[PDB]
Amino acid sequence: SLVCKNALQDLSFLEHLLQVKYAPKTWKEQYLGWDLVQSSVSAQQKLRTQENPSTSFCQQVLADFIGGLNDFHAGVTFFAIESAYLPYTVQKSSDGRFYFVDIMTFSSEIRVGDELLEVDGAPVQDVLATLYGSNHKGTAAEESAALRTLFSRMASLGHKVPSGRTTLKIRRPFGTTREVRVKWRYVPEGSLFYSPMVPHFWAELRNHYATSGLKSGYNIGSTDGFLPVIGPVIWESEGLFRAYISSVTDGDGKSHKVGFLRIPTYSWQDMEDFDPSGPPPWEEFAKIIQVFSSNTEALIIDQTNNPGGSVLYLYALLSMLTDRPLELPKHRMILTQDEVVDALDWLTLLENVDTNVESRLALGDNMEGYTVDLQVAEYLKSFGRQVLNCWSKGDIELSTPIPLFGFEKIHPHPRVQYSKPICVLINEQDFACADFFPVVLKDNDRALIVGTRTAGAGGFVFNVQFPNRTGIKTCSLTGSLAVREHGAFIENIGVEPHIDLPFTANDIRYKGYSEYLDKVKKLVCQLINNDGTIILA
């Protein structure tokens, strides 16, 4: 077949792209087993083997390949439009049940709180396994994604787009069984530092959301969470974010002013309702804090469902969530004939900068939120050098561990800091930066991370666009890995919550998240008292 050749062709490219630009290679070779070569063969197999190959099909074939590294940072995208979609949304319960947390608004026999059992005579569980990846590992983070795409399919990512009528065995809340038939909203097919850390995933997902109804607060990076109010609101903010203050009462009857606040995405420009010319979402963040700095005892931060974003804006917000410097880890990275270039600009930009003024003069008054400061210009210099320290050494294959940009540690916003207790909320759908957050805090003991394990560590991604004959718009590959002592940072990929805590079916059933919250408030309260939550009760 003509396609198969071209398929095979563009495949050998991807193969090469893994060896040249995929930092976590060496790593991945251990934990998972994944052996690029013998995986590349399975590719051919599937290709030559198939009857007259479909273009789309080969795309899938390819997608699978990369999507097997089991790295959310890496995968492929194709110039495609074809796509399926059902106006529903679900969440899996602790024990293991599936409830309809939201129906868009097309008013159908289906309503909220309904347990989903089977699709076309197939128990959800099985219907989902089909959606899993190659080296599926049975983790929460994954089970989610699957579900995530259950009712939203994109050819753009190689998903096998369906269409037509379908069954939906939903069990009412009474213990009674019903079966519905619905139609898929189908669509016919017609630098290296400065790259936002986010999974490819989103890029198209984000575009998909806006494009088709689904605007719900259950989707990644929603300005508003999906967690109802934590009690009687005493203060709120009619701003860009979703913030308020409420009075919580412990196990005695003594009131406390607790502060809610949900960072949704770290790629700020993309914040729902953001107006460019006006003030930056980080200047207004500072405000929500200066109002907590004095009118609040504790701070709950919902960071669930965050995609990732700009490493520096993330760095910027921490800057104002602590009165003391925080410890930043190092990353092994890969460097090409252009990150080198990028550094040659840092160095020559602020080569003769001694004063704390010249510092802000050159680099501006702030870098995406974080404040300028000779200390910073001094970080970039030390950065710009290190890049070239690992350039001419025959080690581009994982440069010595280096701190993102010159930054070794965070520095307290010379203007606003939150000296009081903080508790962060996280779950299976927090990526790239969304990890760097709970982690950095938790590695300095500044927060009390609760909820389920993250989605997986961060690192600059490589957005490689290359000429091909198979629709590959782009291929994004992870270009940096976090190190430890002197290395090998893993055995999971995930910041673990101090307090493991899933969503109990009782929470989900009526969108009340009653129990989840209670346990939170408690924890907050034990903190309110002094510091250090003794036991889980």
How would you portray this structure in words?
The protein has helices at 2-21, 25-28, 36-49, 55-66, 124-129, 140-150, 200-211, 283-290, 311-318, 339-349, 356-363, 374-389, 433-442, 505-509, 514-529; strands at residues 75-78, 83-85, 88-92, 98-103, 115-118, 152-154, 165-171, 177-183, 233-236, 243-249, 255-262, 298-302, 330-333, 366-367, 370-371, 402-403, 422-426, 447-451, 461-464, 472-478, 480-482. By secondary structure, the chain is an alpha+beta fold. The chain has three domains: 1-79, no CATH class; 80-190, Pdz3 Domain (Roll); 191-537, no CATH class. It has a six-stranded mixed sheet with strand order 9-10-11-12-17-18, with helices on both faces. A three-stranded antiparallel sheet has the order 1-20-19, sandwiched between helices. α3 (36-49) runs antiparallel to α4 (55-66). It is globular, with a radius of gyration of 24 Å. The N and C termini lie far apart (64 Å).
List keywords for this structure.
Pdz3 Domain; PDZ_sf; serine-type peptidase activity; Protein CT_858; alpha+beta; 537 residues; six-stranded mixed sheet; three-stranded antiparallel sheet; ClpP/crotonase-like_dom_sf; 3 domains; endopeptidase activity
